[PDB]
């Protein structure tokens, strides 16, 4: 196969930030209607506020971010972690990282951890295929339609590369 329970969380982390990632531009996703390459921000807002650019929404809300993420890191490292959802186990019942800290140097094994159904996990990756659809168009064809009985599978037009941009 491949390798050992190295990253799970790393990619899990990734898949966590993922769904709600693809929930992000999933507003442009158009309930019914309101999209394009974005500029704005949830709803509302109107304090004083969340601003530009001698301010930026950036560094303010995302300096402090750091200790909110380092806690996890050092939490991973020196476990550290809930009781225990994400590193790792209590309920119920995901895809097991399974191993404990060392090998024969490395291989007293390495991977008898498959088995089951459709299950929990899946959707975590779903949003990165979403992505590799959803990124690719949006600068290549920057709107997202779906349209039967009209002209699905017919088309209409054409649109390639060098036009210009």
């Amino acid at each position: 196969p491949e390798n050992l329970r190295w990253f799970v969380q790393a990619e899990l982390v990734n898949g966590r930030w993922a769904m709600l990632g693809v929930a992000g531009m999933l507003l442009p996703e158009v309930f019914t209607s309101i999209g394009i390459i974005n500029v704005p921000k949830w709803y509302a807002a109107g304090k004083e506020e969340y601003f530009a650019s001698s301010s930026t929404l950036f560094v303010i809300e995302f300096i402090l971010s750091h200790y909110v993420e380092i806690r996890r890191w050092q939490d991973i490292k020196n476990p550290g972690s809930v009781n225990q959802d994400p590193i790792f186990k209590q309920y119920s019942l995901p895809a097991g990282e399974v191993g404990y800290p060392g090998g024969i140097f490395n291989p007293l094994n390495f991977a008898p951890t498959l088995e089951a159904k459709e299950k929990e996990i899946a959707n975590g990756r779903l949003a990165m295929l979403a992505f590799l659809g959803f990124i690719i168009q949006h600068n290549v064809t920057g709107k997202g339609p779906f349209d039967n009985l009209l002209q699905h599978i017919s088309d209409p037009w054409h649109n390639t590369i060098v036009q210009t941009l």
Binding site: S53, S54, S55, T56, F58, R71, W73, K77, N78, G80
Partner: protein, 175 residues
């Protein structure tokens, strides 16, 4: 070491000898392993330059500043003469205060025991975390803003009416 491996802010849990079983910094190395001139000096410094600084009033009433208060120092002295000295300004006044200071904590020179630390055993507010342990936050509190005090020295540390400057620069200038 480096990361992503490290380094036990994640509890222990924790402290911790006992306990529960930990280390954690590696049982007491020293980036000097012996040790000083530059160490703990990073501490009592800026506690006590930064009180000297409270002094510029916010002024809502008026102040400024005294009787003699030096006229930006350049030429309000002395008016001398006797005679007649410097201008003043330049190297001379800037010479007195110096070696006057320059001797005061350098007779201190002679130091070895009485008392050199814990060192092997015992078998400045004595044992003092607080009063001393601030030593840190009293330095960089200062640079923290003197970074902008050497960045954009606009006019008056009104500071925030706008935002938290946060400007942002970007880490570059660009990106």
């Amino acid at each position: 070491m480096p990361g992503e491996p490290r380094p036990a802010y994640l509890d222990g849990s924790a402290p911790g000898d006992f306990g529960f079983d930990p280390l954690g910094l590696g049982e007491v190395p020293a980036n000097l392993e012996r040790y000083k001139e530059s160490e703990l000096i990073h501490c009592r410094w800026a506690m006590l330059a930064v009180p000297g600084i409270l002094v510029p009033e916010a002024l809502g009433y008026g102040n400024w500043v005294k009787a003699q208060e030096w006229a930006a120092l350049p030429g309000g002295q002395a008016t001398y003469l006797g005679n007649p000295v410097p201008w003043g300004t330049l190297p001379t006044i800037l010479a007195i205060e110096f070696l006057a200071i320059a001797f005061v904590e350098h007779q201190r020179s002679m130091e070895k025991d009485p008392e050199k630390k814990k060192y092997p055993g015992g078998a400045l507010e004595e044992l003092k975390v607080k009063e001393i342990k601030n030593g840190r936050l009293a330095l960089l509190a200062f640079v923290g803003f003197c970074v902008q005090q050497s960045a954009y020295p606009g006019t008056g540390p009104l500071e925030n009416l706008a935002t938290h400057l946060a400007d942002p620069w970007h880490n570059n200038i660009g990106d």
